[PDB]
Write a structure and sequence with these properties.
This is part of a larger assembly, with chains A (51 residues), B (94 residues), C (61 residues), D (286 residues), E (233 residues) and F (150 residues). Chain B has four helices and one strand; from the N terminus they run ααβαα. Chain B has 94 residues and is mainly alpha-helical. Chain D folds into two domains: 181 residues, no CATH class; 60 residues, no CATH class. Chain D starts with a strand and ends with a helix. Classes of the chains: A mainly alpha (51), B mainly alpha (94), C mainly alpha (61), D alpha/beta (286), E mainly alpha (233), F mainly alpha (150). Chain F: One of its GO terms (cellular component) is cytosol.
């Protein structure tokens, strides 16, 4: 449920506590931008159809 | 005397040099690092005392001769990488 | 060339009692080079890597 | 102690003038002058200077003459023109100090106790920083060695107050580089840095060779400081750093890639817009 | 195979042509047993098909791609076999790809007996014949993709191999041929798979970005380079 | 005894009590013992607190210098059992006294914080910036000695 950041390994009977690193916003702005530019490249197609 | 890169010191090697048992190499470094003769850190799982120095010692002709021979290598690399940049970016270098 | 009669002066008496003379600066090498040091950086500069904490923030920004 | 001696642009442009005044006719070595300037917390501000008749002889290296009355009277005039300047040291364009510097410095100590001599290498125009600032200290050399006069070194930096800054900026106005840098100038900033680091390391090597070959005295101090720099190296081969370097190099490439793509789609869009432009005008011509 | 070896296809070529040459080279490469490159060119050849004009070319390429992929140990994309134009055309290959995943050799032979003759006209029967004695590879890949330390005796059970000894040559061979990334520790008969690493901390992502950025920058130059400013009228 | 608490070095409790316990607790005619550590109920509690206070300082020196000290070797160095030493560190970490992550599986008490990439290179950058400063400062000192020792 995302209560605490950890993992339960059963083969050693241990709960591996750790720290969640951020979601590195920069990559999220790039992935959103890629889709953005993916849509613009489409609208370039339509200008290309006019020839 | 470390080779620099291998700045870590296995507990055995320190205990063998000073003929001091491994249980007290842990405290010997504890002191030497306490007065200010070192700026490293101590590991126990491996018991290799990672070393970083800020306390220099007086030198010697052979020590300086040795210290300069290393530095001739260092300027050789610094020169080589400079050429590999100036030659590479001649058009852009402007 | 090098100027046209400035209005903020033509009113205070020009070509009527005082005329301007073209002003030209005799800068020569060995003087420009010593002035270039005013903002010249140094060898250390250009190899300093910025700092990554504000670089990542800047790249993200 | 003086943390810095900030030499204003006007002084190094009068010294250059001072060197030219004489060398043009009376071919001679270093031209000596007085350096005026206002004090600060510890950073001595050099704001102006003037020449002092100085004649020297290569024999005995102590048959010189630095005029006293000219130095006294000159400053008598200048404190009239501007009162924020006090005599603070001297300058000589001879790149290498002389044996006469200590004795003459003692003289200028008679006008300012904390006298700093600034060597301006007027003739050279090279890597940079044409000023080298020196003080006078007489210490027991802690580590059991003869006492002597010697010139200790003080960090020098060249700055500009507002008024001279405006004049200087126009004075170049033909070779100034863009402040933005741009990719072209930034990279040149690094080929320049590499050339220096090699050049500084080569001065270090020659001296180490000199001490290694004996031709110079093992300082026993500052000698191991160079040993300090030799331990402060990064040791990049370390695995945990090797991983952490690829992450940031990879962290940046994904931004240059996104930067590259945007510049490409814009490029294509600009050709499609242009292909329409000339074509449409092509049909519209008929 | 020679002619392509010495000849160089003009890089600045018509899309229509670039698509064609890629198929023929793919056909040649596939026969020459250079499978892995056959897929890369054929998939690239397919990508260059003139969107929707050539119902045929897309039909034949998909025919080789499905058979080419099978011989390499990869189950082809299902969205292929449902598409309108290639629906009935590739349906003959459909029964095949189902056979390979099922690994029911009896089913595989049955299809070649019936639909096999049609393959010849497509010029693929020979390639299918390679597969009939290569159906074991994929199941070796399926086992290596899911299991990470499967004991050899278990591999024999899950691939129908007759003996635990027989799998060893096949298990190694698939390991030997780079269809797997595993090491067979014969000391105790277990096919360990390679411990996968955090790639983002290694240099793989940078290299993938370089090939990307070089093309992105090149596109800018190609766009800018032509730009065809008509001689100002 | 005052100096030991300002000396940034490990101080074994058993050494301290064996060395200062008699003079402090018992006292003598020459050494007029104090009531702080007397045999009374409140005194003994203070003596437990001295063993607690001594242990904590041994922790800080452990945290300042060590990076990964095994729990047992840490137990020996505090004069506590494996379990108690675990509790005392835990009570410290919960109260934010020190930074510790007891990897109870292997008996490791790692102290160094997780190293973020932005700091790892940034620390390396700081080393280089200091090194570049040393190269200039040592160069000027070198150009100084060439001038003076003509």
């Amino acid at each position: 449920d995302k209560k605490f950041h950890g993992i339960l390994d059963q083969g050693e009977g241990v709960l591996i506590i750790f720290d969640e690193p951020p979601v590195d916003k920069t990559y999220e702005a790039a992935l959103e931008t890629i889709q953005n530019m993916s849509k613009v490249v489409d609208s370039l197609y339509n200008k290309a159809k006019k020839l | 005397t470390r080779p620099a890169n291998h700045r870590q010191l296995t507990f055995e090697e320190i205990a063998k040099s000073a003929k001091i048992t491994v249980n007290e190499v842990e405290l010997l470094v504890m002191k030497a690092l306490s007065v200010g003769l070192v700026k490293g850190s101590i590991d126990e799982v491996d018991k290799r005392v990672h070393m970083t120095w800020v306390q220099p010692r007086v030198l010697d002709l052979q020590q300086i001769k040795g210290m300069k021979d290393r530095l001739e290598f260092w300027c050789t690399d610094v020169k080589s990488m400079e050429m590999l940049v100036e030659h590479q970016a001649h058009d852009i270098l402007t | 060339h090098l100027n046209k009669p400035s209005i903020q002066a033509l009113i205070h008496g020009l070509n009527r009692h005082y005329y301007s003379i073209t002003i030209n600066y005799r800068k020569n090498e060995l003087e420009q080079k010593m002035l270039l040091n005013l903002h010249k950086k140094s060898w250390m500069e250009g190899l300093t890597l910025q700092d990554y904490s504000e670089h990542c923030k800047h790249n993200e920004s | 102690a003086v943390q810095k001696v900030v030499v204003h642009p006007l002084v190094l442009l009068s010294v250059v003038d001072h060197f030219n005044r004489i060398g043009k006719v009376g071919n001679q070595k270093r031209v000596v002058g007085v350096l005026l300037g206002s004090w600060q917390k510890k950073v001595l501000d050099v704001s102006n200077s003037f020449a002092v008749p100085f004649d020297e002889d290569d024999k005995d290296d102590s048959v010189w003459f630095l005029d006293h009355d000219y130095l006294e009277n000159m400053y008598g005039m200048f404190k009239k023109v501007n009162a924020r300047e006090r005599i603070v040291g001297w300058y000589h364009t001879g790149p290498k100090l002389h044996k006469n510097d200590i004795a003459i410095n003692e003289l200028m100590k008679r006008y300012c106790p904390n006298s700093v001599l600034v060597i301006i290498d007027v003739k050279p125009k090279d890597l940079g920083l044409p000023t080298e600032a020196y003080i006078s200290v007489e210490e027991v050399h802690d580590d059991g060695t003869p006492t002597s006069k010697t010139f200790e070194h003080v960090t020098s930096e060249i700055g500009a107050e507002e008024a001279e800054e405006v004049g200087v900026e126009h004075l170049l106005r033909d070779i100034k580089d863009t402040t933005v840098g741009t990719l072209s100038q930034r990279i040149t900033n690094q080929v320049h840095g590499l050339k220096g680091l090699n050049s500084k390391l080569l001065d270090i090597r020659s001296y180490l060779e000199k001490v290694a070959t004996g031709k110079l005295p093992i300082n026993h101090q500052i000698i191991y400081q160079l040993q300090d720099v030799f331990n402060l190296l990064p040791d990049v081969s370390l695995q945990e750093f090797v991983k952490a370097f690829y992450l940031k190099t990879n962290d940046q490439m994904v931004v240059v890639y996104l930067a590259s793509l945007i510049r490409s789609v814009v490029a294509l869009h600009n050709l499609i817009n242009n292909k329409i432009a000339n074509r449409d005008a092509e049909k519209k011509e008929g | 195979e020679k002619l392509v070896s010495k000849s160089v296809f003009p890089e600045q070529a018509n899309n229509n042509e670039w698509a064609r040459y890629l198929y023929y080279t793919g056909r040649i490469k596939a026969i020459q047993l250079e499978y892995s490159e056959a897929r890369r060119t054929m998939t690239n050849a397919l990508r260059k098909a003139p969107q929707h004009t050539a119902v045929g070319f897309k039909q034949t390429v998909h025919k080789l791609l499905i058979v080419v992929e099978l011989l390499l140990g990869e189950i082809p994309d299902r969205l292929q076999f449902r598409q309108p134009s290639l629906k009935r055309s590739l349906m003959p290959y459909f029964l095949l790809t189902q056979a390979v995943r099922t690994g029911n050799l009896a089913k595989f032979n049955q299809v070649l007996d019936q639909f096999g003759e049609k393959f010849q006209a497509d010029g693929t029967y020979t390639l299918i014949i390679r597969l009939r004695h290569n159906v074991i590879k994929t199941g070796v890949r399926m086992i290596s993709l899911s299991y990470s330390r499967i004991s050899l005796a278990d591999i024999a059970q899950k691939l129908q191999l007759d003996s635990p000894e027989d799998a060893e040559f096949i298990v190694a061979k698939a390991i030997r041929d780079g269809v797997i990334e595993a090491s067979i520790n014969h000391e105790k008969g277990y096919v360990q798979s390679k411990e996968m690493i955090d790639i983002y901390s290694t240099r793989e992502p940078q290299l993938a970005f370089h090939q990307r950025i070089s093309f992105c920058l090149d596109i800018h130059n190609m766009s800018v380079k032509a730009m065809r400013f008509p001689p100002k009228s | 005894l005052l100096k030991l608490f300002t000396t940034m070095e490990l101080m074994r409790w058993s050494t301290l009590v064996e060395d200062y316990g008699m003079e402090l607790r018992k006292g003598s005619l020459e050494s007029p013992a104090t009531d702080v550590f007397g045999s009374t109920e409140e005194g003994e509690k203070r003596w437990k607190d001295l063993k607690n206070r001594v242990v904590e300082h041994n922790i800080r020196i452990m945290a300042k210098y060590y990076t990964r000290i095994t729990m047992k070797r840490m137990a020996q160095l505090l004069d506590l059992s494996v379990d108690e030493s675990e509790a005392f560190l835990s009570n410290l970490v919960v109260n934010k006294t020190i930074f510790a992550k007891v990897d109870r599986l292997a008996g490791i008490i790692n102290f160094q914080r997780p190293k973020d990439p932005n700091n790892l290179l940034n620390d390396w950058s700081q080393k280089l910036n200091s090194l570049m400063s040393l190269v200039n400062k040592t160069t000027h000192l070198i150009a100084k000695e060439e001038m003076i020792h003509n």
